[PDB]
Design a protein around this nucleic acid. Structure first.
Ligand SMILES: CN(C)[C@@H]1C(O)=C(C(N)=O)C(=O)[C@@]2(O)C(O)=C3C(=O)c4c(O)ccc(Cl)c4[C@@](C)(O)[C@H]3C[C@@H]12
Ligand SMILES: CN(C)[C@@H]1C(O)=C(C(N)=O)C(=O)[C@@]2(O)C(O)=C3C(=O)c4c(O)ccc(Cl)c4[C@@](C)(O)[C@H]3C[C@@H]12
Ligand SMILES: CN(C)[C@@H]1C(O)=C(C(N)=O)C(=O)[C@@]2(O)C(O)=C3C(=O)c4c(O)ccc(Cl)c4[C@@](C)(O)[C@H]3C[C@@H]12
Ligand SMILES: CN(C)[C@@H]1C(O)=C(C(N)=O)C(=O)[C@@]2(O)C(O)=C3C(=O)c4c(O)ccc(Cl)c4[C@@](C)(O)[C@H]3C[C@@H]12
Ligand SMILES: [Mg+2]
Ligand SMILES: [Mg+2]
Ligand SMILES: [Mg+2]
Ligand SMILES: [Mg+2]
Ligand SMILES: [Mg+2]
Ligand SMILES: [Mg+2]
Ligand SMILES: [Mg+2]
Ligand SMILES: [Mg+2]
Ligand SMILES: [Mg+2]
Ligand SMILES: [Mg+2]
Ligand SMILES: [Mg+2]
Ligand SMILES: [Mg+2]
Ligand SMILES: [Mg+2]
Ligand SMILES: [Mg+2]
Ligand SMILES: [Mg+2]
Ligand SMILES: [Mg+2]
Ligand SMILES: [Mg+2]
Ligand SMILES: [Mg+2]
Ligand SMILES: [Mg+2]
Ligand SMILES: [Mg+2]
Ligand SMILES: [Mg+2]
Ligand SMILES: [Mg+2]
Ligand SMILES: [Mg+2]
Ligand SMILES: [Mg+2]
Ligand SMILES: [Mg+2]
Ligand SMILES: [Mg+2]
Ligand SMILES: [Mg+2]
Ligand SMILES: [Mg+2]
Ligand SMILES: [Mg+2]
Ligand SMILES: [Mg+2]
Ligand SMILES: [Mg+2]
Ligand SMILES: [Mg+2]
Ligand SMILES: [Mg+2]
Ligand SMILES: [Mg+2]
Ligand SMILES: [Mg+2]
Ligand SMILES: [Mg+2]
Ligand SMILES: [Mg+2]
Ligand SMILES: [Mg+2]
Ligand SMILES: [Mg+2]
Ligand SMILES: [Mg+2]
Ligand SMILES: [Mg+2]
Ligand SMILES: [Mg+2]
Ligand SMILES: [Mg+2]
Ligand SMILES: [Mg+2]
Ligand SMILES: [Mg+2]
Lengths: 91, 91, 91, 91
RNA sequence: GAGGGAGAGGUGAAGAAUACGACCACCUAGGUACCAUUGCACUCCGGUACCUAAAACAUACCCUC
RNA sequence: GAGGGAGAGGUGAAGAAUACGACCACCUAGGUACCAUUGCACUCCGGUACCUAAAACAUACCCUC
RNA sequence: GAGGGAGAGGUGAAGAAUACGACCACCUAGGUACCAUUGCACUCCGGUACCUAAAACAUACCCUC
RNA sequence: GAGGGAGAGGUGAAGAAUACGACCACCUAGGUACCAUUGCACUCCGGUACCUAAAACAUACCCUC
């Protein structure tokens, strides 16, 4: 994919409760720049995944490159740019 | 919060015994500067949490920024400045 | 061993499914340069092990040195140069 | 303690078999310099502990400082200088 | 008589031909399994169930003669 | 007659008033729990036990009338 | 009469000498164990089993007198 | 007679018409589950329970004829 304000994370530990996952993702990622939102759902299709929306695409890029494969509750994070803009970025 | 000599850590693994937790927190954090004390309680309200008191606010700041989200017994540490001075700092 | 386009990893967590292992190994290693392939088998003789084939021996060398002992699904990765060229490198 | 060619590690995961522990400790530590030996015993008194003997005290010092608190099979390593020279260093 | 065995987390009560372990009452520290808890403190203190807390001798107690 | 229900991992055999799922035989991929394995490859392939592999109709099969 | 005890996730129905908890019907949030899921979203929503959702009084209900 | 089957961690004892596996005694390495242990070493060595330690033939042993 191509750089995007939003990174898509998967291979996340699915036992982690939604709000803990968000707070923890925030703690991994805030070092890279300002975060607008972190979206998590534990539904069947969306579990093990998160979207982290940065204010700036440069934050997204550094995040993705630095945290690629990083240990997070016992599994390595796999990180991609989101395939499309998040609503709050497009709008 | 605002910088403080003391950092507040949570999202800690609650199976870890108090003295092990302290010794381990000391090993994460001593690289950042001198530590006056580490307070841990496994009570219901205080489990999963620690206070690490640095001699210098600059140590606290580097600690917090470097170790934010860091893997510690299988969970990411979440770090904040303490909301108030610890007794040994105020007094 | 002597430098090789291919690194041999072992001490891998054997519960991890083959395609997850590959995707995760790719996420640990792609930072070091271009990867031609990652070979994994869960057979008795080959479980807990992977071969990661880099385009360039310099990528292999940096990978091996940086990721040596690195946490990966709860175990430290142990990394060596492959003892021989992978087919796609020799051919 | 005072710098020593040998570092003493504890808080090690005690489920890990002796030879795996050695190979893994070797993989954490060889980046710091040449290692003469790694001693591990799983006896009651000596389990959860290792001695890593470096050729040079400077290797020991960098190791200790860099790897202090580092994640190793799910627990943070706690590192000290050995209190005395190992036999192979004294002799 | 012999010879073996087992009992002390702490305080008490009982008993005292007994410094001494069971029974009974009360109180503590530490842990384990499960459940609940994401929580900002600077005497301690969630729940349910289980476990552990130096030890020889002697009395009493158990086995063999 | 009505009305309900359940059966297809793949190939075969049986049966065919039947494209069609059970029984029987054979073969595959993927997984789970436990045990074993630290192992250098570039067709696949450790063990023990369990599970899963699109699905409507029709025949046959099960229930009510 | 006395004295004890237990019941409210939410809506309803029943009942109302009763604001009030069981039974019955319906609906929600959160979790746990196991199984399945590697998945690109920007109302929610996999399965199987289990659990939890402030609480005093009163009626009714249970025990002792 | 035929044909099938199963037994060797190591040392010993028994037995020897037998190099040879069961029974019995003793000793080792490695592991697993649970419990305990945070511990500074440079012969080994916590507990409780379970498991594993190359293997063909022959004797003996088990099944069919
Ligand atoms: C109170 N009396 C009946 C007993 C008694 O008189 C004794 C005696 N020596 O005569 C006791 O020692 C006893 O009072 C006494 O203290 C006993 C005692 O200490 C004890 C302990 O500690 C552990 C196990 C046991 Cl079986 C006993 C036990 C049963 O011996 C009791 C016994 C009584
Ligand atoms: C061989 N014969 C006794 C049966 C038969 O003649 C049939 C028939 N239609 O007459 C079949 O279909 C059958 O040959 C036939 O194929 C059967 C069949 O397919 C089936 C399946 O697939 C699943 C469940 C069931 Cl209970 C059956 C079952 C029992 O109907 C069998 C029946 C036989
Ligand atoms: C409908 N009738 C038989 C009962 C009745 O007439 C009552 C009464 N006060 O007379 C009720 O309160 C009742 O209608 C009524 O509502 C009952 C009730 O609320 C209740 C609750 O909440 C919890 C436990 C229990 Cl045991 C009861 C229970 C049994 O008392 C019922 C009783 C009935
Ligand atoms: C001592 N005597 C009764 C037996 C004997 O005389 C033998 C014989 N060949 O006559 C043995 O081989 C025996 O002494 C002997 O050594 C036996 C033996 O080795 C053995 C093993 O290794 C495994 C399984 C089994 Cl069932 C046996 C077993 C039962 O055959 C014994 C048998 C005895
Ligand atoms: Mg790291
Ligand atoms: Mg006792
Ligand atoms: Mg004792
Ligand atoms: Mg006592
Ligand atoms: Mg005393
Ligand atoms: Mg007294
Ligand atoms: Mg007594
Ligand atoms: Mg008295
Ligand atoms: Mg306690
Ligand atoms: Mg929990
Ligand atoms: Mg408790
Ligand atoms: Mg005694
Ligand atoms: Mg089926
Ligand atoms: Mg199907
Ligand atoms: Mg079939
Ligand atoms: Mg077909
Ligand atoms: Mg056919
Ligand atoms: Mg048929
Ligand atoms: Mg036919
Ligand atoms: Mg398969
Ligand atoms: Mg294993
Ligand atoms: Mg298998
Ligand atoms: Mg159907
Ligand atoms: Mg209730
Ligand atoms: Mg309630
Ligand atoms: Mg209700
Ligand atoms: Mg209301
Ligand atoms: Mg109503
Ligand atoms: Mg009522
Ligand atoms: Mg009415
Ligand atoms: Mg819910
Ligand atoms: Mg899974
Ligand atoms: Mg569910
Ligand atoms: Mg009440
Ligand atoms: Mg055997
Ligand atoms: Mg054998
Ligand atoms: Mg033997
Ligand atoms: Mg021999
Ligand atoms: Mg002999
Ligand atoms: Mg014999
Ligand atoms: Mg003889
Ligand atoms: Mg052993
Ligand atoms: Mg433990
Ligand atoms: Mg043992
Ligand atoms: Mg044989």
């Amino acid at each position: 994919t191509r750089p995007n304000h939003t990174i898509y994370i998967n291979n996340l530990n699915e036992k982690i409760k939604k709000d803990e996952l968000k707070k923890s993702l925030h703690a991994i990622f805030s070092r890279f720049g300002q975060i607008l939102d972190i979206l998590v759902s534990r539904s069947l299709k969306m579990r093990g995944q998160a979207f982290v929306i940065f204010k700036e695409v440069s934050s997204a890029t550094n995040a993705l490159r630095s945290m690629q494969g990083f240990p997070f509750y016992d599994k390595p994070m796999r990180i991609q740019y989101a395939k499309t803009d998040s609503d709050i970025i497009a709008k």
